[PDB]
Design a protein around this ligand. Sequence first.
Ligand SMILES: N[C@@H](Cc1c[nH]c2ccccc12)C(=O)O
Ligand SMILES: [Cl-]
Ligand SMILES: [Cl-]
Ligand SMILES: [Cl-]
Ligand SMILES: [Cl-]
Ligand SMILES: [Cl-]
Ligand SMILES: [Mg+2]
Ligand SMILES: [Mg+2]
Lengths: 189, 454
Amino acid sequence: GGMILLIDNYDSFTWNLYQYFCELGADVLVKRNDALTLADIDALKPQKIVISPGPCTPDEAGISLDVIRHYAGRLPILGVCLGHQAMAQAFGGKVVRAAKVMHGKTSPITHNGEGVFRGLANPLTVTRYHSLVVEPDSLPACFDVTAWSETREIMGIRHRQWDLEGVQFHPESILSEQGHQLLANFLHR
Amino acid sequence: HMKTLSPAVITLLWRQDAAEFYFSRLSHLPWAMLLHSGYADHPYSRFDIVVAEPICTLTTFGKETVVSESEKRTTTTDDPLQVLQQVLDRADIRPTHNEDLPFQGGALGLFGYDLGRRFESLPEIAEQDIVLPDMAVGIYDWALIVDHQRHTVSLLSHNDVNARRAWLESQQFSPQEDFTLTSDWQSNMTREQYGEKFRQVQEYLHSGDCYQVNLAQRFHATYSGDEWQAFLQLNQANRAPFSAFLRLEQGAILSLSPERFILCDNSEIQTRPIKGTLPRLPDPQEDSKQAVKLANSAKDRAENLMIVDLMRNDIGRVAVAGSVKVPELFVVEPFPAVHHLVSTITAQLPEQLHASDLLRAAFPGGSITGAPKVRAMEIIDELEPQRRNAWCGSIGYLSFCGNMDTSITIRTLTAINGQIFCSAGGGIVADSQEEAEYQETFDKVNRILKQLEK
Ligand SMILES: N[C@@H](Cc1c[nH]c2ccccc12)C(=O)O
Ligand SMILES: [Cl-]
Ligand SMILES: [Cl-]
Ligand SMILES: [Cl-]
Ligand SMILES: [Cl-]
Ligand SMILES: [Cl-]
Ligand SMILES: [Mg+2]
Ligand SMILES: [Mg+2]
């Protein structure tokens, strides 16, 4: 089938991600990161996986890291905020304090028109709820940086071989520009 | 035995003051309740609703809900909104929706802020010093509806509308000694204490995993005389479209709220969080400057957008797949004391849910707690010296037809045992300033506090 599995990491906004994907006509199953095993995912046979934001570290995000390790190269995966950092960590990346902590602030980001930014305007204004970024110096070679903040912080990554992509912002915030088309790129791609 | 047919309706003389005129003679009865649109010029100022003499009452204090009908009392520890929905269902009154009669009987009353403790595990630091129910709801098989759009006064009843009309016209409005404050207002916090609590909030905000917290102080005074006289004057001066007067067993709730919480109208959901305030200015052209300044303020837009995102999430969890929209962001609404920044979120209620389930999923409002909501509520319990009780809860109705409307009980006074309480708060974010936020609380209720000084 075309079922999308959204792994809920206990974010304030995870049902906004669910509703945006329903607006695009997706069949979405939502499971908390500790209510699901790898064996369960195998039985469900999702076409794709989304790893949601959440207020914990990648290590504390239940099966989130295990899903990246087991399904990278097997199913398309999208990481949002925590999901994006988990993606970075799983391949050898490091996460560090951002310049300024950003809680419901909009910033312009510049992208390369690749991955989820295919066909989207540049620059793009997006909503941020995070205090950590993926450290640019230690970013595994397998990732391209797909988007930068005005202060040169990583806002997006794409795996060079596999359908495996992270965004550091909330595309589903009502003031995140082209949030629907960005997620449509992941859905229909 | 299931009653599907419309209630019987008698139309009465149109007069603009019809609700205050008829309610005056009911205002002393426990379970007499008024929803009043404040005579406001406002997109969501249309109806006044009057009820009294409920067929059933629900009173929640902590873990216990007492359900009372003429000669039977039951106590239960079940979810109070599940108990409410069961009581509505068991009345066997199931009318079709009517856009001109949005309440066709059903539940009407108070959902106190502390009812939120039934839906979320919270600590118990703040002092419980007001003994008033977490839920005080009547079940009414009749209503008086004043429709300011059609200029119609309708009396509906599922029993005997002629007898109800006779009963209403037979009630007479007694003299009643005038309201007077018998002390000065005193806050539950000094400036310095507010400072300490404000700094502790911003300490939690900087450490992340809190984005925003609504911090409030409470004014208290003693009073004597009729609370209804106070309401008539406050109502005139506040012109607030979600105003209400509830006569409860334990005291009186005088709501001058301008804030709609959740509307459910023929399964169309609407919520209108208020986040953003600036005081009104006396000079009309400087005041138009204030209005545009609030609309274009980066600090208050950010505060508001966060609550819009939170309300989208709480509604979105239970809304029809794909139904959530934000048709209006950052609109400025003027009220006598203040300009407010108002956003509007819409959705569709699934056929399998009740309005009561929507209220459980979202209560209490994002706009008077913060984000994340449970962490905000923990911080509020830690730092606010007393529980909010009726303040920053909701007043409204759950119609037998399935409709609902609720307020946020901001700009709301509690009158109990010769004490009157009035609270005022504001959203605190990383960029908030100690002194400006303290001053904002006074800007919100100063006209209310000053009008009651005589
Ligand atoms: N303004 C609402 C009615 C109303 C007035 N005060 C209220 C308090 C709570 C809920 C609804 C109301 C309407 O026109 O329909
Ligand atoms: Cl580059
Ligand atoms: Cl409980
Ligand atoms: Cl006090
Ligand atoms: Cl505000
Ligand atoms: Cl307030
Ligand atoms: Mg503010
Ligand atoms: Mg039912």
